[PDB]
């Protein structure tokens, strides 16, 4: 693993300590603003479920994707920063995000 943001965060957040996860997205917004998405635009999830919601506005996100030569234990990621709408699946009470469906 290099020293770029993705390699470091994937490791510190216990995502690549025991394996190399292909892709992961990190959202750079306050926790409460992300939780607020669960009462925003209702949309169908990729699986057909209807408990997904899309944020009205774009949010700061970092996409982490394994490179072609990445192999455990030396996971390697390409870091891509962008501003896009997030789509999350919400459940429970309080109604909060439990899955990151996608980003637009």
């Amino acid at each position: 693993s290099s020293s770029n943001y993705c390699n470091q965060m994937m490791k510190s957040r216990n995502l690549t300590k025991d394996r190399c996860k292909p892709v992961n997205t990190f959202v750079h917004e306050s926790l409460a603003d992300v939780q607020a998405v669960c009462s925003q635009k209702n949309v169908a999830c990729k699986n057909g479920q209807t408990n997904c919601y899309q944020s009205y506005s774009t949010m700061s996100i970092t996409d982490c994707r394994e490179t072609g030569s990445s192999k455990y234990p030396n996971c390697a990621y390409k870091t891509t920063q962008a501003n896009k709408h997030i789509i999350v699946a919400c459940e429970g009470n309080p109604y909060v995000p439990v899955h990151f469906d996608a980003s637009v």
Partner: peptide, 15 residues
């Protein structure tokens, strides 16, 4: 141990 909500935060949130 951790809930689905907690897992989401650990894996995706970086305030």
């Amino acid at each position: 141990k951790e809930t689905a909500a907690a897992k989401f935060e650990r894996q995706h949130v970086d305030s």
